[PDB]
Amino acid sequence: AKLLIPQAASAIEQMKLEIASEFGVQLGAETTSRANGSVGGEITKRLVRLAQQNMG
Amino acid sequence: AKLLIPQAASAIEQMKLEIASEFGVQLGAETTSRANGSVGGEITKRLVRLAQQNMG
Amino acid sequence: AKLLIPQAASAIEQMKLEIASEFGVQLGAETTSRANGSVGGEITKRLVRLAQQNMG
DNA sequence: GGGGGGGGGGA
DNA sequence: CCCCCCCCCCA
């Protein structure tokens, strides 16, 4: 799960737990894919949205 | 083809065209889906990276 | 790629293959976006036709 | 495995 | 809407 910028590990980590509770999902191997994936989906969606903001 | 932040359309377009040149691919109907697709993959990668950077 | 109705996956899959054959198009990354796209166009066309028929 | 963000098409 | 891609991230 390496990132482009490892120094951001802390950042995403916060946003991760944030989105988790929002959708009400428990990031664990005992959970479905559509559940663990929905999180990573929102994370990417937000990172993109922010980047598009600092360019508009 | 609505973007998350349509106000960035012009910025992402210039990014698209510049990446196409750097990649040597000529965007178009007659281009392979792989070549066209690669430009879109770079946009997301760079946007995600820039987000992580200017954040964490 | 998640279709409106995932359960239709198998059916659209067969229609796709049958359309590819009629068109003489080989679906793939190295195939032009136009050739690949042509197939998706027929699929939507036939689906809309079926819906208009079984609707009166 | 999944979700999301982009690229190029066709109907 | 469907087709073919590429990328990011979660697990």
B33-40's contacts with Cβ under 8 Å and 24+ in sequence apart are: B33/C28, B33/C29, B33/C30, B33/C31, B33/C32, B33/C33, B33/C36, B34/C29, B34/C30, B36/C33, B37/C29, B40/B16
Q: What is the largest CA-CA distance in chain A?
A: 41
Residue-number span of the structural domain to which C55 is assigned: 1-56
Q: Do chains C and A touch (3 or more CB pairs under 8 A)?
A: no
- The total of structural domains in chain C comes to 1
- Residue pair A35/A16 in contact (Cβ under 8 Å)? The answer is no
Neighbours of A34 (CB within 10 A): 9
- Experimental technique used? X-ray
Q: How far is B30 from chain C (nearest CA, A)?
A: 5
Resolution in A: 2.1
Q: What is the largest CA-CA distance in chain C?
A: 41
The position carrying tokens 């969606």 is A45
Q: C11 vs B2, B19, C53, CA distance in Å?
A: 29, 38, 18
CATH, residue B28: 6.10.10.80
Which of B8, B12, B56 is closest, CB to CB, to A8? B56
Residues in chain A: 56
> How far from the centroid of its chain's Cα atoms is residue B8's Cα?
12
